[PDB]
Design a protein around this ligand. Structure first.
Ligand code: HA3
Ligand code: K
Ligand code: K
Ligand code: ZN
Length: 354
């Protein structure tokens, strides 16, 4: 069946996050309509596309204490394999789109550094193989986890074939992990092809749906469409959703909204989209968003957004964060060179003017 795939495996387990998510997906019936595929460990060679051999050898090998982390490393290896496996099946046609219910997160682990609960950058190794083994010419990586995807930025900071974009809380380098200034735009041949949609201004107020929805309207989608990729890999973290406190979270997106965001990202690349779980720790929130994202992947009719949110103009701290990022990347993209700024308008308004 040519439909929305999933990837699960209970050998990734220490109810937990991915277990709850998977449960929701069953009970809601979305799991039925999807094609659950088989996973595998990532190969040492596969992991070395992104990481160093020294790092691979240390953490890749099978040899409330020290052995906790060892299993989490063993899980992370399997995570990369699942994410590799789904991505290839969607990319080659076998499936329409996907969603990897995998843990731990990955987008933090750097070349030879395990940080932020992350051992191996799943979404990255996936992208690396797409290039090498399927000669894919353009890969879009949207990373909507609340945090900056420092691993993923580094992986492709010189390759203009992989457009990396990241919506995150930045606060002028006063948040985890600290990287991800909008000023960072790539390097060498890959200048212009790294876009940090970096929110500055703290929680006054907290960034919400309208703020992110604006950000898509004005930055993400314009650049992505122009760029026009063959495969979309989303580092789909749900720590932006409501119910993650100030420090290990901060913002208040509805889960509902992430469906809309999936729905929009499906516009690109023939719908060749795959989402992969990163952050998001509140069990209701991540179950909600997972429900919404997969529903949208199956092309189910979506629950309309509250009139309120559709009518709400984005907060100043956002509008200011958008204009700075837009300004910078107006140097490298035509859809930012033509126009005057409209990042202060609500959705309904922006559409009232098409
Ligand atoms: O969501 C994530 N990855 O997907 C995160 C990775 C790392 C995160 C982070 O901000 N950390 C800083 C806070 N922290 C702690 C804390 C330790 C004491 C008090 C508050 C936090 C332990 N580990 C971390 C990692 S969030
Ligand atoms: K890049
Ligand atoms: K991000
Ligand atoms: Zn996170």
């Amino acid at each position: 069946r040519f439909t929305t795939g999933l990837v699960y495996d209970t050998l990734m387990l220490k109810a937990g996050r991915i277990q709850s998510i998977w449960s929701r997906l069953q009970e809601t019936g979305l799991r039925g309509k999807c094609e659950a595929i088989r996973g595998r460990k990532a190969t040492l060679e596969e992991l070395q596309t992104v990481h160093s051999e020294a790092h691979t050898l240390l953490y890749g090998t099978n040899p409330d204490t020290i052995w906790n982390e060892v299993h989490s490393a063993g899980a992370a290896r399997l995570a990369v394999g699942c994410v590799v496996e789904l991505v290839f099946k969607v990319a080659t046609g076998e499936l329409k789109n996907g969603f990897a219910v995998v843990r731990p997160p990955g987008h933090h682990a750097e070349e030879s550094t395990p940080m932020g609960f992350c051992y191996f950058n799943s979404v990255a190794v996936a992208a690396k193989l797409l290039q090498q083994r399927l000669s894919v010419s353009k890969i879009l990586i949207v990373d909507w986890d609340v945090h900056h995807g420092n691993g993923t930025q580094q992986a492709f900071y010189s390759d203009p074939s992989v457009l990396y974009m990241s919506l995150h809380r930045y606060d002028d380098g006063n948040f985890f992990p600290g990287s991800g200034a909008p000023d960072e735009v790539g390097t060498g041949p890959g200048v212009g092809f790294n876009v940090n949609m970096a929110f500055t201004g703290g929680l006054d107020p907290p960034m919400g749906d309208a703020e992110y929805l604006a950000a898509f309207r004005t930055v993400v989608m314009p650049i992505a469409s122009e760029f026009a990729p063959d495969v979309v890999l989303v580092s789909s973290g749900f720590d932006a959703v409501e119910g993650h406190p100030t420090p290990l979270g901060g913002y208040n997106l509805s889960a509902r909204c992430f469906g809309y965001l999936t729905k929009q990202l499906m516009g690109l690349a023939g719908g060749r989209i795959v989402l992969a779980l990163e952050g998001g720790y509140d069990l209701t929130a991540i179950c909600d968003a997972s429900e919404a994202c997969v529903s949208a992947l199956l092309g189910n009719e979506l629950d309309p957004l509250p009139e309120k949110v559709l009518q709400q103009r984005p907060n100043a701290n956002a509008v200011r964060s958008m204009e700075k990022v837009m300004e910078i990347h107006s140097k490298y993209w035509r859809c930012l060179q033509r126009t005057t700024s409209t990042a202060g308008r609500s959705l309904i308004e922006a559409q009232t003017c098409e």
